[PDB]
Amino acid sequence: DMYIERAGDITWEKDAEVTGNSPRLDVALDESGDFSLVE
Amino acid sequence: GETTDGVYRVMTRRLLGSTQVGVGVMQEGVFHTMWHVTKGAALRSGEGRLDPYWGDVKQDLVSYCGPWKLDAAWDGLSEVQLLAVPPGERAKNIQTLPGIFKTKDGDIGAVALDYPAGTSGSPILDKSGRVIGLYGNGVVIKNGSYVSAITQGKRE
Numbered sequence: 001d002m003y004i005e006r007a008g009d010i011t012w013e014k015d016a017e018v019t020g021n022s023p024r025l026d027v028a029l030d031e032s033g034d035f036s037l038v039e
Numbered sequence: 040g041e042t043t044d045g046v047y048r049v050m051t052r053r054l055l056g057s058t059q060v061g062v063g064v065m066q067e068g069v070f071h072t073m074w075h076v077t078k079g080a081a082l083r084s085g086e087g088r089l090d091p092y093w094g095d096v097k098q099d100l101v102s103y104c105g106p107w108k109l110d111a112a113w114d115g116l117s118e119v120q121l122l123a124v125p126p127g128e129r130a131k132n133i134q135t136l137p138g139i140f141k142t143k144d145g146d147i148g149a150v151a152l153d154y155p156a157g158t159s160g161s162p163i164l165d166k167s168g169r170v171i172g173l174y175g176n177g178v179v180i181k182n183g184s185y186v187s188a189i190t191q192g193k194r195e
């Protein structure tokens with residue numbers, strides 16, 4: 001049985017660590033809600 | 040129980056110790072998370088109980104206590120922030136410029152950030168602090184890395 005616990009406010013942080021690239025991918029979404037890559 | 044707006048861990052004691060299975064967003068008295076975190080099961084909040092209200096496996100979203108409330112959308116141009124809530128660790132903001140999932144039914148923003156399974160449901164924010172979607176439904180790409188859709192519901 002699951003329970004929730006507060007972890008903080010939802011706010012933008014002005015000087016946050018910046019990470020990650022910006023990939024552009026062709027994807028398919030099936031009936032089970034799973035994404036797959038198409039090629 | 041506590042219903043203050045904010046980000047929440049989704050926990051269980053069914054396994055060894057207490058395990059963080061995901062994350063969600065409380066806004067306007069409604070709890071929002073990804074379907075696959077809870078499988079649509081009822082939740083406990085302190086002494087109270089949150090019952091599921093709306094959900095959809097294909098969108099991989101679920102709301103508790105009322106309809107989906109989050110309606111902000113990525114502007115397709117600006118950097119966003121993942122408010123990641125990793126198991127056993129403090130909430131942290133990670134800024135990034137989303138990529139794009141291209142589908143037959145349109146384009147979706149996507150974030151190339153890789154966080155463990157327990158962080159699914161963490162909110163993705165725009166510069167105004169509005170939640171533009173939830174993290175944790177996406178793809179593993181060749182380089183081993185993870186790319187998450189910016190998954191947003193519909194506010195009726």
Ligand SMILES: *C(=O)[C@H](CCCNC(=N)N)NC(=O)[C@H](CCCCN)NC(C)=O
Binds near residue numbers: 033
């Ligand atoms: C949260 O449950 C995780 C977050 C990503 C962890 N994986 C990683 N960093 N490589 N989400 C999932 O594991 C996704 C479950 C989605 C199920 C939809 N029906 N899995 C994927 C591939 O996104």
